[PDB]
Design an enzyme around this catalytic site. Structure first.
Site, short mmCIF file in Angstrom:
data_model
loop_
_atom_site.label_atom_id
_atom_site.label_comp_id
_atom_site.label_asym_id
_atom_site.label_seq_id
_atom_site.Cartn_x
_atom_site.Cartn_y
_atom_site.Cartn_z
CG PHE A 1 -2.02 -1.01 1.16
CD1 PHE A 1 -1.74 -2.37 1.19
CD2 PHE A 1 -3.34 -0.60 1.05
CE1 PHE A 1 -2.76 -3.31 1.10
CE2 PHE A 1 -4.37 -1.53 0.95
CZ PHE A 1 -4.08 -2.89 0.98
CB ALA A 2 2.30 3.33 -2.20
CG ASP B 1 4.70 -1.77 6.34
OD1 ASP B 1 3.51 -2.06 6.08
OD2 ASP B 1 5.11 -1.57 7.50
CB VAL B 2 5.53 0.94 0.21
CG1 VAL B 2 5.22 2.21 0.98
CG2 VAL B 2 6.17 1.24 -1.14
CG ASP B 3 8.05 2.50 5.27
OD1 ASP B 3 7.25 1.56 5.14
OD2 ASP B 3 8.36 2.97 6.39
CG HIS C 1 9.01 -6.32 16.00
ND1 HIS C 1 10.15 -5.59 16.29
CD2 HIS C 1 8.03 -5.42 15.79
CE1 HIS C 1 9.86 -4.30 16.26
NE2 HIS C 1 8.58 -4.17 15.96
CB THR D 1 4.67 -3.96 22.58
OG1 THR D 1 4.99 -4.26 21.22
CG2 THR D 1 5.92 -3.49 23.29
CD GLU E 1 3.74 -4.88 15.16
OE1 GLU E 1 3.98 -4.27 16.23
OE2 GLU E 1 4.50 -4.84 14.17
C1 LIG Z 1 12.43 -3.06 22.61
C2 LIG Z 1 11.59 -1.86 22.17
O1 LIG Z 1 10.50 -1.62 22.70
N1 LIG Z 1 12.07 -1.20 21.11
C3 LIG Z 1 11.35 -0.11 20.45
C4 LIG Z 1 10.55 -0.68 19.28
O2 LIG Z 1 9.49 -1.55 19.72
C5 LIG Z 1 10.13 0.33 18.22
O3 LIG Z 1 9.71 -0.33 17.01
C6 LIG Z 1 8.28 -0.28 16.87
O4 LIG Z 1 7.68 -1.39 17.56
C7 LIG Z 1 6.25 -1.32 17.53
C8 LIG Z 1 5.66 -2.48 18.33
O5 LIG Z 1 6.12 -2.42 19.69
C9 LIG Z 1 5.76 -1.39 16.08
O6 LIG Z 1 6.10 -2.65 15.52
C10 LIG Z 1 6.42 -0.27 15.27
O7 LIG Z 1 6.04 -0.39 13.89
C11 LIG Z 1 7.95 -0.36 15.39
O8 LIG Z 1 8.57 0.74 14.72
C12 LIG Z 1 8.91 0.40 13.36
O9 LIG Z 1 9.88 -0.67 13.34
C13 LIG Z 1 11.09 -0.34 14.04
C14 LIG Z 1 12.03 -1.55 14.05
C15 LIG Z 1 11.77 0.86 13.37
O10 LIG Z 1 12.17 0.51 12.04
C16 LIG Z 1 10.81 2.05 13.32
O11 LIG Z 1 11.40 3.11 12.57
C17 LIG Z 1 9.49 1.64 12.67
O12 LIG Z 1 8.55 2.72 12.73
C18 LIG Z 1 11.26 1.30 17.90
C19 LIG Z 1 10.77 2.39 16.95
O13 LIG Z 1 9.71 3.12 17.57
O14 LIG Z 1 11.76 1.89 19.11
C20 LIG Z 1 12.38 0.92 19.96
O15 LIG Z 1 12.87 1.58 21.13
CL LIG Z 2 -2.42 -7.31 3.52
CL LIG Z 3 0.70 -5.36 4.52
HG LIG Z 4 -0.50 -5.39 1.95
#
Ligand SMILES: CC(=O)N[C@@H]1[C@@H](O)[C@H](O[C@@H]2O[C@H](CO)[C@H](O)[C@H](O)[C@H]2O[C@@H]2O[C@@H](C)[C@@H](O)[C@@H](O)[C@@H]2O)[C@@H](CO)O[C@H]1O
Ligand SMILES: [Cl-]
Ligand SMILES: [Cl-]
Ligand SMILES: [Hg+2]
Ligand SMILES: [Hg+2]
Ligand SMILES: [Hg+2]
Ligand SMILES: [Hg+2]
Ligand SMILES: [Hg+2]
Ligand SMILES: [Hg+2]
Length: 263
Positions: A60-61, A129-131, A151, A163, A221
């Site tokens: 999706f974009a 995801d696209v990014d 993750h 989480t 998620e």
């Molecule tokens: C151990 C801890 O809590 N680390 C933090 C991460 O959980 C954060 O990642 C984000 O996690 C949430 C779910 O908890 C969700 O999956 C978010 O999409 C995810 O953020 C994305 O993925 C990350 C790996 C990065 O690439 C981020 O730029 C993305 O937006 C991260 C980021 O908020 O912070 C850690 O401290």
């Molecule tokens: Cl999907």
């Molecule tokens: Cl998706």
């Molecule tokens: Hg998708």
């Protein structure tokens, strides 16, 4: 019906020599956890080509995200299911903004402006995801009825640290003593049937929460994790498949960084 494989010459697997001794390569429900070194891609490529497998990749974009399509598609052309039939499905609110990317033979792209069609066009659906950008091989080793991806921030964490949605008022609720892994919503897939079953289940669960005035901590998620907890994936992809090197570096446990976040 599956035709027999042809004669192949490759290293004999060693029963008394584990693939990896540093990581878990199979889940408690006997689903392989995909890490570099666990699979012989030549054998897997043969098996899937003999079935003329077609893989659909959905992305999706919307809005500003259309700017990530060029790098995404260009790198997918170099690393995603090369040699196999691929059908890209780009869902966007800006059809005319989709970049003109040159595709290899047997690969096509459809732009859908914002599906029984999926059932008749592809065998497997991969949702990402696209990014992001592909940096290394992402192939048929991931194909299975249903798969989730570990993750990158929680693969070494205890379940209580996950989480998950912790509010019992939510359909995505998962108590502290439950949970196998924390899957990232940015990369999942499986057969068309299993993916539609999952998306259908999550869509309904999210509607129930909405009617109850509650929104899961990590939205889609959170529901994906609840679904995969109750319907075990038949394969789990290692963080090699969803990494962020700027944020997490490059640990020895990762022999390859295949699909990564774009800074
Ligand atoms: C151990 C801890 O809590 N680390 C933090 C991460 O959980 C954060 O990642 C984000 O996690 C949430 C779910 O908890 C969700 O999956 C978010 O999409 C995810 O953020 C994305 O993925 C990350 C790996 C990065 O690439 C981020 O730029 C993305 O937006 C991260 C980021 O908020 O912070 C850690 O401290
Ligand atoms: Cl999907
Ligand atoms: Cl998706
Ligand atoms: Hg998708
Ligand atoms: Hg091995
Ligand atoms: Hg999808
Ligand atoms: Hg769900
Ligand atoms: Hg949903
Ligand atoms: Hg979901």
């Amino acid at each position: 019906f599956m035709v027999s494989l042809p004669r192949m010459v490759y290293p004999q697997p060693k029963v008394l020599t584990p693939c990896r001794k540093d990581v878990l390569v199979v889940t408690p429900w006997l689903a392989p956890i995909v890490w570099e070194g666990t699979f012989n891609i030549d054998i897997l490529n043969e098996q899937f080509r003999l079935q003329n497998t077609t893989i659909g990749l959905t992305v999706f974009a919307i809005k500003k995200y259309v700017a990530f399509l060029k790098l995404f598609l260009e790198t997918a052309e170099k690393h995603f299911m090369v040699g196999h039939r691929v059908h890209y499905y780009v869902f966007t609110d800006q059809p005319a903004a989709v970049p003109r990317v040159t595709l290899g033979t047997g690969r096509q792209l459809s732009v859908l402006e914002v599906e029984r069609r999926f059932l008749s066009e592809v065998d497997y659906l991969v949702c990402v995801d696209v990014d992001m950008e592909f940096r290394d091989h992402v192939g048929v080793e991931i194909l299975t009825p249903l798969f989730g991806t570990l993750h990158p921030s929680f693969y070494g964490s205890s379940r209580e640290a996950f989480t998950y949605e912790r509010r019992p008022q939510s359909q995505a609720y998962i108590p502290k003593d439950e949970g196998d892994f924390y899957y990232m919503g940015a990369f999942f897939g499986g057969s068309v049937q299993e993916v539609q079953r999952l998306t259908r289940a999550c869509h309904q669960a999210m509607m129930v929460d909405q009617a109850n005035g509650i929104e899961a901590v990590w939205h889609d998620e959170s529901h994906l994790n609840k679904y995969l907890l109750r319907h075990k994936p038949t394969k789990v992809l290692s963080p090699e498949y969803l990494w962020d090197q700027q944020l997490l570096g490059w640990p020895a446990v990762l022999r390859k960084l295949r699909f990564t976040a774009v800074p």
